[PDB]
């Protein structure tokens, strides 16, 4: 540390280096609930989490109960230990509440005043955050597994919806259009994800074992089908020997991660679909529904956090190296989300907990001359062989 | 859509089937208008009158 | 060393007794106290012994775990690090992996585990976060 | 009678199966999509549809 | 019914017989069933019905568990078995192998069904 | 030395690994009819960095040193075979057989030029000029097996004997760990134990597979390497 501080003060190293090094060290030090609980509002499993992109203060949660909960993550108490309290909820008393489990919540990418929700009740809903009233509602023939709004598109406001139907659907919130379908897939579409680099490029994953990249401006059909063997454009390509149930672009958009029920994670070049041949080993993935997982941002290494049964596995994206297993939950983890500002990970599970994983690099320090106001050696940490 | 083409191949299969045998156990009879069943090639060949 | 640990944990867990032999358990405690490496191998032995398809071996190994959990921080850390599997092995929270026969020993194991875990929750759960989560999971979500 | 049911939580059709553990007089219904599970006491007269009905009733009882 | 029976008698991948033609238990059939093709098929079928692996020569690949429902076939892993590709595997059965199925290929190759 | 090491708290080649594993293969068990097969899993037991292993294997494929074949008994079941063994054994098996000329054509044309695990009918018909009857000759030879209509895996003749022995041996050797005390077994003790009659391919070959497939965890001990069933 003191070396980094000296090098920064003297301009020997760019201020980038201390910042990225310490961010990486913090990710390596994640510990369960060290400073922080999250308030138990849900009665069911936590299907989905989304941290607000503007300030990172607020987290939406959706669950198998159909409830949507909005949490405040900032410690506005003066204590070193605190609870992330629920600001407000769309509970079962609300008229517009979802009838069946809520499978994706996403903030509007450009300000916090609106958010979107989807559910196995075959709806996509648009919510006014200040009032928690729906502004628009879209209905579908089939249960929605996933939806996404483009994180970078200013030009268009399209929601991609993946359903049990074989056709991807696109809803235009500006016009209210929901007629536009993409017709290339053959089974249920389990994950959809817009490129963070390009306004118009949508990745889609399906139980047909295919990941397809689309340019939604075109009348032409899809661009690229990912072939895990690298050899041919559509006739037989598969990304996994199983269902493909999760997508995550890397934070630069240059690669796409995919996870599937073959228990493998695979890294792809997003500009042409080449399998980069990074091998992570067995990544346990039994999930028959979409799996949400996340990369880090702003670290010296790009990490990926992936549900691994009841654990969260951490890998280095490019090296394939398994770094740690975060070992908290009692049932399968369904989502995790990364707070980029402070390198804190939140995780939802079918055990109904939301758990915070927080960098725990060192303890509060005593003064040895104190009587009892020290940083206490609690007797729970003591042996008792007598 | 895959389920439409599945249902259409299923219907083609049913018609090619009822051309040879219109006395299948677990499927509806092929019929003319006014509802009379069609005579298949099997019923042409089968019985004492066949 | 390791052979003595092996023989002690066999003679304790093949015993079929309703309670531990105090002298052999004193020897096991002495070994565990003598080396973190041997305590770690004792944990890895007992968790494996708790897999045995016979309820009296599970009951014996659980009684050893209960005796050691009160007595070392490192053993508490180890046990709590796998508490999900431990509870599957000792309360049968997974209906695909139920407790083995006999029922008469399984009822002893289940009661003793419930009592022990509630005691550990009161004595340690505020320090071991995953233990308090486990207790809540039992009480509210498996409705124990 | 039907022995496979629509999940009350995830709305997937024919996603729930019943395991009749007669020896312990208990019945477990489990959804393969969301792994929500419910346990009810069963009698020798009891059948999969009685376990499913008990689960739907317990769900509507929890909505109160 | 013949389609189902022949599928249970050949490798779903290499289209060789699911039992060794050279085995004494099949040379028994080929002696005791000359000119009796239906008898050949019946005795080859009741040998093959218990196999699950192509080793018996052979590839190593496991085999399905086909079941009829009306006019549909289900291949156990629940794949509904297409008539195409059933054409493909039948197309690759050798004339010597289908002769042991009792299907003289000069007159009734199985893919023609 | 004084800044970069502070950034975070965190050599056998695939060619060497393949060449070592290839000697564990019992050639006489198959009358040498099979070319020696090494599984991709076993390579990861000697080259623990799976990414480096896979990339070096891909480079050996591009030099044409090795063939990768899908063995179908599991999703990841890839056999690694030296091209010259494969070519020699297949030509020796084809001598005077009726499919022989198409197999000579395949080994003279497709395999020198393609690394693929599978071929589609478009390539086979138009790029390499195979007649549809020649694909039938290749399937009779065992060099292809039907993947799907108009598509085929590259295969090894007689792989069923190996695959049978491997699948049963794998379950046997894994049960030797499962049944031993604590589910623990020291590797030196296992390799010293009289192998089951089920374990026909040899016991070291299987421990390298099991370790590479992550079916067993190695734990290092003062007593040496210890096998365990993984917490999974
Ligand atoms: Zn469900
Ligand atoms: Zn075969």
CB A144 within 8 A of CB A123: yes
The secondary structure element, H or E, covering residue F154 is strand F151-154
Query: CA angle, corner F123, sides to F117 and F129, nearest 5?
Result: 120
- CA dist., res. F84 & res. F90, Å (int): 10
**E51 alpha carbon – ligand 2 mean position (Å):** 12
The two beta strands, D37-41 and D26-31, are antiparallel
Q: How far is C48 from chain F (nearest CA, A)?
A: 5
Q: Give the other-Cβ count within 10 Å of E5's Cβ.
A: 16
Q: Which residues of chain C lie closer than 8 angstroms to A353, CB-CB?
A: 133
Strands laid side by side in the F144-148 sheet: F118-120, F151-154, F144-148
Query: What is the three-class DSSP state of F85?
Result: helix
Give just the sign of the alpha carbon dihedral F200, F201, F207, F209: negative
- Report which of E106, A234, A262 is spatially closest to residue F122, judged by C-alpha positions: A234
DSSP letters, E14-58, are T-SBSS-TTSHHHHHHHHHTTT-HHHHHHHHHHHHTT--BTT---
Q: Give the other-Cβ count within 10 Å of A323's Cβ.
A: 18
DSSP letters, A76-95, are -SSSSSEEE-EEEEE-TTST
Shortest CA distance from A187: residue in chain B: B2
A167 touches B at CB < 8 Å: yes
- Report which of A339, F109, F142 is spatially closest to residue E61, judged by C-alpha positions: F142
CB A43 within 8 A of CB A65: yes
Q: How far is A186 from chain B (nearest CA, A)?
A: 7
CB A125 within 8 A of CB A116: yes
CB F129 within 8 A of CB F113: no
- CA dist., res. A318 & res. A151, Å (int): 23
What are the residues whose beta carbon lies below 5 Å from ligand 2 (ion)? E 11, 13-14, 54, 59
- CA dist., res. A304 & res. A314, Å (int): 6
The secondary structure element, H or E, covering residue F161 is helix F159-179
Q: Which residues of chain E lie closer than 8 angstroms to B13, CB-CB?
A: 71
The two beta strands, A82-84 and A36-38, are parallel
- Asked whether the beta carbons of residue C6 and residue F184 sit closer than 8 angstroms, the reply is no
Q: Which residues of chain C lie closer than 8 angstroms to A330, CB-CB?
A: 84, 133-134, 137, 141
- Report which of A330, A292, A359, A305 is spatially closest to residue A61, judged by C-alpha positions: A292
Q: What residues contact C103, with CB distance under 8 A and at least 6 apart? A: none
- CA dist., res. F40 & res. F45, Å (int): 9
What are the b/e assignments for A211-229, b being 16+ CB within 10 Å?
A: bbbbebeeeeebebbbbbe
- CA dist., res. A360 & res. A35, Å (int): 9
Structure-block tokens of residue A352: 């109904």
- Asked whether the beta carbons of residue D12 and residue A45 sit closer than 8 angstroms, the reply is no
Touch F-D: 3+ C-beta pairs under 8 A: no
Backbone angles phi, psi at A39, to 5 degrees: -65, 130
Q: Which chains touch A (3 or more CB pairs under 8 A)?
A: B, C, D, F
Backbone angles phi, psi at E103, to 5 degrees: -125, 85
Shortest CA distance from A184: residue in chain B: B1
Query: What is the three-class DSSP state of F125?
Result: helix
DSSP letters, F171-209, are HHHHHHHHHSGGGEEEHHHHHHS---TT-TT-HHHHHHH
DSSP letters, A152-214, are S-SS--EEEEEESSSSEEEEETTT----EEE---SS-EEEEEE-SS-TTEEEEEETTS-EEEE
Break-preceding residues in chain F (C–N over 2.5 Å): 10
**A64 alpha carbon – ligand 1 mean position (Å):** 9
- Asked whether the beta carbons of residue D10 and residue A121 sit closer than 8 angstroms, the reply is no
E71 touches B at CB < 8 Å: yes
């Amino acid at each position: 540390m003191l070396g980094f501080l000296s090098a920064r003060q003297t301009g020997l190293e760019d201020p980038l280096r201390l910042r990225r090094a310490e961010s990486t060290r913090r990710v390596l030090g994640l510990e369960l609930n060290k400073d922080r609980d999250v308030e138990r509002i849900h009665g069911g499993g936590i299907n989905t989490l989304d941290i607000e992109p503007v300030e990172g203060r607020y987290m939406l949660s959706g669950g198998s109960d159909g409830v949507i909960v909005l949490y405040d993550l900032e410690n506005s108490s003066r204590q070193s230990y605190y609870t992330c309290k629920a600001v407000c909820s769309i509970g079962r008393d609300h008229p517009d509440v979802h009838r069946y489990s809520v499978e994706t919540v996403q903030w509007y990418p450009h300000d916090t005043g609106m958010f979107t929700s989807s559910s196995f009740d075959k709806t996509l809903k648009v919510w006014d955050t200040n009032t928690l009233q729906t502004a628009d509602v879209f209905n579908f023939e089939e249960t929605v597994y996933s939806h996404h709004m483009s994180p970078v598109s200013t030009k268009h406001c399209l929601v991609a919806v993946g359903t049990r139907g074989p056709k991807v659907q696109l809803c235009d919130l500006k016009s209210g259009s929901c007629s536009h379908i993409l017709q290339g897939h053959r089974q249920e579409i389990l994950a959809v994800s817009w490129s963070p680099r390009y306004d118009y490029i949508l990745a889609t994953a399906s139980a047909d074992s295919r990941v397809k990249l689309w340019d939604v401006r075109r009348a032409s059909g899809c661009l690229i089908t990912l072939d895990q063997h690298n050899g041919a454009v559509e006739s037989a390509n598969t990304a996994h020997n199983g269902k493909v149930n999760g997508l995550c672009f890397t934070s630069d958009g240059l690669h796409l991660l995919t996870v599937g029920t073959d228990n493998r994670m695979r890294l792809w070049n997003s500009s042409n679909g080449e399998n980069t041949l990074v091998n992570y080993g067995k990544v346990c993935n039994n999930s028959k529904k979409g799996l949400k997982f996340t990369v880090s941002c702003g670290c010296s290494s790009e990490f990926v956090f992936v549900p691994y049964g009841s654990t969260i596995a951490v890998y280095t994206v490019y090296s394939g190296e398994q770094i740690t297993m975060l070992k908290g939950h009692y049932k399968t983890v369904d989502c995790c989300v990364f707070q980029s500002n402070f390198q804190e990970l939140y995780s939802g599970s079918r055990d109904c907990n939301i758990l915070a994983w927080v960098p725990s690099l060192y303890e509060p320090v005593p003064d040895d001359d104190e009587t009892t106001t020290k940083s206490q050696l609690n007797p729970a940490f003591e042996d008792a062989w007598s | 859509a895959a389920h439409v083409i599945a249902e259409d191949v299923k219907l083609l299969q049913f018609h090619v089937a009822t051309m040879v045998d219109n006395e299948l156990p677990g499927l509806p009879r092929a019929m003319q208008k006014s509802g009379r069943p069609l005579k298949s090639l099997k019923q042409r060949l089968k019985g004492k009158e066949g | 060393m390791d052979q003595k640990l092996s023989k002690l944990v066999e003679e304790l867990t093949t015993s079929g007794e309703p309670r531990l032999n105090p002298e052999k358990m004193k020897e096991l405690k002495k070994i565990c106290k003598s080396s973190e490496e041997q305590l770690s191998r004792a944990y890895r032995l007992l968790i494996a012994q708790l897999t045995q398809e016979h309820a009296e071996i599970r009951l014996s190994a659980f009684q050893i775990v209960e005796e050691l959990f009160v007595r070392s921080h490192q053993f508490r850390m180890l046990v709590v690090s796998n508490f999900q599997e431990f509870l599957e092995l000792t309360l049968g929270t997974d209906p695909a992996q139920p407790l083995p026969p006999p029922r008469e020993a399984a009822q002893r194991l289940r009661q003793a585990t419930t009592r022990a875990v509630e005691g550990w929750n009161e004595k340690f759960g505020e320090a071991y976060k995953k233990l308090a989560l486990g207790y809540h999971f039992l009480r509210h979500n498996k409705k124990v | 009678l039907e022995t496979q049911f629509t999940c009350p939580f995830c709305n997937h059709e024919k996603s729930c199966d019943v395991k009749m553990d007669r020896a312990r007089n208990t019945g477990v219904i489990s959804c393969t999509v969301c792994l929500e599970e419910f346990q009810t006491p069963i009698t020798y007269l009891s059948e999969p549809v009685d376990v499913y009905s008990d689960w739907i009733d317990a769900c509507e009882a929890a909505n109160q | 019914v013949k389609t189902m029976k022949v599928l249970r008698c050949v490798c779903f991948f290499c289209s060789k017989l699911l039992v060794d033609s050279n085995n004494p238990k099949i040379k028994d059939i080929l002696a005791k069933s000359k000119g009796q093709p239906k008898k050949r098929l019946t005795h080859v079928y009741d040998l093959c019905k218990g196999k699950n692996i192509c080793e018996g020569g052979g590839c190593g690949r496991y085999q399905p568990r086909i079941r009829r429902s009306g006019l549909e076939l289900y291949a156990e892993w629940k794949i509904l078995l297409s008539p195409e590709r059933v054409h493909e595997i039948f197309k690759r059965i050798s004339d010597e192998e289908c002769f042991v199925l009792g299907m003289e290929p000069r007159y009734a190759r199985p893919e023609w069904m | 030395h004084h800044l970069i090491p502070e950034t975070f708290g965190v050599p056998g080649s695939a060619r060497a690994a393949v060449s070592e594993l290839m000697q564990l293969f019992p050639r006489g068990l198959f009358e040498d009819a099979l070319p020696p097969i090494v599984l991709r899993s076993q390579v990861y037991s000697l080259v623990p960095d799976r990414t480096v292993a896979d990339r070096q294997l891909k480079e050996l494929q591009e030099q044409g040193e090795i063939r990768i074949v899908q063995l179908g008994f599991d999703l990841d079941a890839h056999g690694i075979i030296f091209t010259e063994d494969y070519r020699t054994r297949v030509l020796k098996a084809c001598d005077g057989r009726p499919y022989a000329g198409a197999v000579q054509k395949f080994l003279a044309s497709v395999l020198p030029a393609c690394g693929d695990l599978s071929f589609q009918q478009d390539q086979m018909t138009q790029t390499f000029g195979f007649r549809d009857s020649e694909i039938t000759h290749l399937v009779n030879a065992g060099v292809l097996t039907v993947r799907d209509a108009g598509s085929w895996w590259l295969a090894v003749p007689g792989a069923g004997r190996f695959i049978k022995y491997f699948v049963k041996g794998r379950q046997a050797v894994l049960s030797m760990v499962r049944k031993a005390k604590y589910r623990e077994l020291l590797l030196s003790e296992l390799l010293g134990r009289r192998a089951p009659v089920v374990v026909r391919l040899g016991l070291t070959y299987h421990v390298h597979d099991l370790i590479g497939a992550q079916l067993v965890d190695c734990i290092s001990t003062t007593s040496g390497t210890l096998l365990r069933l993984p917490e999974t």
